[PDB]
Design an enzyme around this catalytic site. Structure first.
Site, PDB file in Angstrom:
ATOM      1  N   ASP A 108     119.129 -55.331  44.650  1.00 19.15           N
ATOM      2  CA  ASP A 108     118.398 -54.123  44.276  1.00 19.15           C
ATOM      3  C   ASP A 108     118.833 -52.914  45.107  1.00 19.15           C
ATOM      4  O   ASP A 108     118.351 -52.699  46.223  1.00 19.15           O
ATOM      5  CB  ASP A 108     116.904 -54.362  44.415  1.00 19.15           C
ATOM      6  CG  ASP A 108     116.085 -53.243  43.826  1.00 19.15           C
ATOM      7  OD1 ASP A 108     116.679 -52.247  43.347  1.00 19.15           O
ATOM      8  OD2 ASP A 108     114.847 -53.356  43.823  1.00 19.15           O
ATOM      9  N   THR A 109     119.707 -52.088  44.522  1.00 21.28           N
ATOM     10  CA  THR A 109     120.142 -50.854  45.165  1.00 21.28           C
ATOM     11  C   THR A 109     119.031 -49.828  45.310  1.00 21.28           C
ATOM     12  O   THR A 109     119.203 -48.857  46.053  1.00 21.28           O
ATOM     13  CB  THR A 109     121.288 -50.227  44.377  1.00 21.28           C
ATOM     14  OG1 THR A 109     120.833 -49.852  43.076  1.00 21.28           O
ATOM     15  CG2 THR A 109     122.414 -51.212  44.251  1.00 21.28           C
ATOM     16  N   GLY A 110     117.921 -49.985  44.595  1.00 19.82           N
ATOM     17  CA  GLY A 110     116.814 -49.069  44.724  1.00 19.82           C
ATOM     18  C   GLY A 110     115.844 -49.377  45.840  1.00 19.82           C
ATOM     19  O   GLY A 110     114.898 -48.607  46.059  1.00 19.82           O
TER      20      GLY A 110
HETATM   21  C1  LIG Z   1     110.818 -46.015  44.944  1.00 17.85           C
HETATM   22  C2  LIG Z   1     112.117 -46.653  44.408  1.00 17.85           C
HETATM   23  C3  LIG Z   1     111.833 -47.994  43.711  1.00 17.85           C
HETATM   24  C4  LIG Z   1     110.683 -47.902  42.703  1.00 17.85           C
HETATM   25  C5  LIG Z   1     111.541 -49.014  44.820  1.00 17.85           C
HETATM   26  N1  LIG Z   1     111.444 -50.392  44.256  1.00 17.85           N
HETATM   27  C6  LIG Z   1     112.670 -51.183  43.948  1.00 17.85           C
HETATM   28  C7  LIG Z   1     112.857 -51.183  42.410  1.00 17.85           C
HETATM   29  O1  LIG Z   1     114.088 -51.728  42.064  1.00 17.85           O
HETATM   30  C8  LIG Z   1     111.774 -52.033  41.762  1.00 17.85           C
HETATM   31  C9  LIG Z   1     112.033 -53.512  42.059  1.00 17.85           C
HETATM   32  C10 LIG Z   1     111.023 -54.312  41.207  1.00 17.85           C
HETATM   33  C11 LIG Z   1     109.564 -54.314  41.624  1.00 17.85           C
HETATM   34  C12 LIG Z   1     108.534 -55.086  40.798  1.00 17.85           C
HETATM   35  C13 LIG Z   1     108.983 -55.851  39.563  1.00 17.85           C
HETATM   36  C14 LIG Z   1     110.455 -55.836  39.141  1.00 17.85           C
HETATM   37  C15 LIG Z   1     111.482 -55.079  39.974  1.00 17.85           C
HETATM   38  N2  LIG Z   1     111.876 -51.881  40.316  1.00 17.85           N
HETATM   39  C16 LIG Z   1     110.880 -51.153  39.516  1.00 17.85           C
HETATM   40  O2  LIG Z   1     109.847 -50.722  39.963  1.00 17.85           O
HETATM   41  O3  LIG Z   1     111.296 -51.016  38.160  1.00 17.85           O
HETATM   42  C17 LIG Z   1     110.312 -50.547  37.143  1.00 17.85           C
HETATM   43  C18 LIG Z   1     110.945 -49.756  36.363  1.00 17.85           C
HETATM   44  O4  LIG Z   1     111.854 -50.776  35.462  1.00 17.85           O
HETATM   45  C19 LIG Z   1     111.099 -51.817  35.261  1.00 17.85           C
HETATM   46  O5  LIG Z   1     111.824 -53.170  35.588  1.00 17.85           O
HETATM   47  C20 LIG Z   1     111.364 -53.602  36.748  1.00 17.85           C
HETATM   48  C21 LIG Z   1     109.889 -52.951  36.926  1.00 17.85           C
HETATM   49  C22 LIG Z   1     109.924 -51.759  36.257  1.00 17.85           C
HETATM   50  S1  LIG Z   1     110.131 -51.314  44.880  1.00 17.85           S
HETATM   51  O6  LIG Z   1     110.202 -52.682  44.404  1.00 17.85           O
HETATM   52  O7  LIG Z   1     108.846 -50.741  44.528  1.00 17.85           O
HETATM   53  C23 LIG Z   1     110.300 -51.256  46.663  1.00 17.85           C
HETATM   54  C24 LIG Z   1     109.408 -50.298  47.438  1.00 17.85           C
HETATM   55  C25 LIG Z   1     109.556 -50.209  48.939  1.00 17.85           C
HETATM   56  C26 LIG Z   1     110.571 -51.131  49.596  1.00 17.85           C
HETATM   57  C27 LIG Z   1     110.768 -51.072  51.091  1.00 17.85           C
HETATM   58  C28 LIG Z   1     110.720 -52.482  51.669  1.00 17.85           C
HETATM   59  O8  LIG Z   1     112.044 -50.549  51.260  1.00 17.85           O
HETATM   60  C29 LIG Z   1     111.464 -52.087  48.807  1.00 17.85           C
HETATM   61  C30 LIG Z   1     111.332 -52.175  47.298  1.00 17.85           C
END
Ligand SMILES: CC[C@H](C)CN(C[C@@H](O)[C@H](Cc1ccccc1)NC(=O)O[C@H]1CO[C@H]2OCC[C@H]21)S(=O)(=O)c1ccc([C@@H](C)O)cc1
Lengths: 99, 99
Positions: A25-27
């Site tokens: 996860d690059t995000g």
């Molecule tokens: C702010 C930037 C991002 C939102 C940050 N996140 C990463 C991001 O990839 C999440 C991963 C994810 C989370 C739950 C379920 C599937 C995938 N994906 C996500 O929300 O995707 C949305 C949109 O698409 C859909 O598919 C998947 C869900 C829907 S995080 O998880 O909240 C995060 C927050 C703080 C930290 C500290 C430790 O650094 C680390 C991670």
């Protein structure tokens, strides 16, 4: 390896003597894993994303193997719906985005 | 380009004629932008992240240029913590993970 993104980029990881599936996860700045009862000291933390915040336990210098590539760093443990390999470890396995 | 991950993979995007900064997020299925005005019709949708579910406005078949590469696809608009580019558009610009 090259991973296309038609589907979720899930890979097998090894951590705390357990095998699990996790997103590359690059995000994510840092790494967040599903609840697991690791040994050692930890520090409470709150981390936020879509929907708000969850409470996690921060463990430092944890060894984790991602597709056979070894890394060591901070792992957050808590009620996440998915295991998330963040940039703190992705850099250690030489992972890049390319287009 | 090849993008390393020691820093957040932030890029400039153009949508609705306006430049914004967004995060290339391989852990996101979908693209979610913070509240903004976009032309055309939309539909109410729910999406779930690490902290729960939020209400978003779903805009389909939206033109969006990401780091100089054109995509046309679905863009969700709502109370995300940051602008994220998810796999639905990363695939369109030919983005892969490599290590
Ligand atoms: C702010 C930037 C991002 C939102 C940050 N996140 C990463 C991001 O990839 C999440 C991963 C994810 C989370 C739950 C379920 C599937 C995938 N994906 C996500 O929300 O995707 C949305 C949109 O698409 C859909 O598919 C998947 C869900 C829907 S995080 O998880 O909240 C995060 C927050 C703080 C930290 C500290 C430790 O650094 C680390 C991670």
């Amino acid at each position: 390896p090259q991973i296309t993104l038609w589907k979720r980029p899930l890979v097998t990881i090894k951590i705390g003597g357990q095998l699990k599936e996790a997103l590359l996860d690059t995000g994510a700045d840092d790494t967040v894993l599903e609840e697991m009862n690791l040994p050692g000291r930890w520090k409470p933390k709150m981390i936020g994303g879509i929907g708000g915040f969850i409470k996690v336990r921060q463990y430092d210098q944890i060894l984790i193997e991602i597709c056979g590539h070894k890394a060591i760093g901070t792992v957050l443990v808590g009620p996440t719906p998915v295991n998330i390999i963040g940039r703190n470890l992705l850099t250690q396995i030489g992972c890049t985005l390319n287009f």
